[PDB]
Amino acid sequence: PRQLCDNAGFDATNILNKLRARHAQGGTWYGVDINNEDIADNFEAFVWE
Amino acid sequence: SASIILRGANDFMCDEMERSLHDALCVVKRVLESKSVVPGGGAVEAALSIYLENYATSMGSR
């Protein structure tokens, strides 16, 4: 998840820190959004593997 | 006040017992003097390491 922020030109530190605290609230599907810079749910955004 | 006379066996044996009581006396003294103490031997740093690490995730903002 860190290389996705650097390759997208975003700030890897601010995204990863806010994302790590978000998983402490129980959401397991949250991840990095490549388009907009923010923490979004990849399950509701239909990014699946 | 008080006094304690140590009747021992040999001079080498009773000499070590002299400073041994004075050393252990200051240990019991210092605890009962500052009235609030804390367990030592690295127990303070270990407990703070676990609590402050879970507290870091509840803040954020770098």
UniProtKB/Swiss-Prot annotation, chain A:
- Which residues take part in binding ADP? E49
| Places the protein is found | Cytoplasm
Domain of life of the source: Eukaryota
Functional summary from the UniProt entry: Component of the chaperonin-containing T-complex (TRiC), a molecular chaperone complex that assists the folding of actin, tubulin and other proteins upon ATP hydrolysis. The TRiC complex mediates the folding of WRAP53/TCAB1, thereby regulating telomere maintenance.
The family note in this entry says:
Belongs to the TCP-1 chaperonin family.
Disease with which this protein is associated in UniProt: De novo genetic variants in nearly every subunit of the TRiC complex, including CCT7, have been found in individuals with a broad spectrum of brain malformations, and clinical phenotypes ranging from mild to severe epilepsy, developmental delay, intellectual disability, ataxia, and other features of cerebral malfunction.
Q: How does it assemble?
A: Component of the chaperonin-containing T-complex (TRiC), a hexadecamer composed of two identical back-to-back stacked rings enclosing a protein folding chamber. Each ring is made up of eight different subunits: TCP1/CCT1, CCT2, CCT3, CCT4, CCT5, CCT6A/CCT6, CCT7, CCT8. Interacts with PACRG. Interacts with DLEC1.
From the Swiss-Prot or TrEMBL record, give the protein name. Answer: T-complex protein 1 subunit eta
Q: Which organism is it from?
A: Homo sapiens
Curated annotation (Swiss-Prot), chain B:
Shown stretch of the complete protein: 372 to 433 of 556
Query: Gene of origin?
Result: TCP1
Q: Which family does it belong to?
A: Belongs to the TCP-1 chaperonin family.
Domain of life of the organism encoding this protein: Eukaryota
**Could you tell me what this protein does?**
Component of the chaperonin-containing T-complex (TRiC), a molecular chaperone complex that assists the folding of actin, tubulin and other proteins upon ATP hydrolysis. The TRiC complex mediates the folding of WRAP53/TCAB1, thereby regulating telomere maintenance. As part of the TRiC complex may play a role in the assembly of BBSome, a complex involved in ciliogenesis regulating transports vesicles to the cilia.
The record lists ADP as bound by: G41
Tell me which species this is from.
Homo sapiens
What protein name does the entry list?
Answer: T-complex protein 1 subunit alpha
**Modified positions (N6-acetyllysine) in chain numbering:** K29
| Subunit structure of this chain's protein | Component of the chaperonin-containing T-complex (TRiC), a hexadecamer composed of two identical back-to-back stacked rings enclosing a protein folding chamber. Each ring is made up of eight different subunits: TCP1/CCT1, CCT2, CCT3, CCT4, CCT5, CCT6A/CCT6, CCT7, CCT8. Interacts with PACRG. Interacts with GBA1. Interacts with DLEC1.
The record's disease note says: Intellectual developmental disorder with polymicrogyria and seizures: An autosomal dominant neurologic disorder characterized by a broad phenotypic spectrum. Main clinical features are developmental delay of varying severity, intellectual disability, seizures, and polymicrogyria. Additional variable features are non-specific pyramidal or cerebellar signs, and visual impairment.
Localization in the cell: Cytoplasm, Cytosol; Cytoplasm, Cytoskeleton, Microtubule organizing center, Centrosome
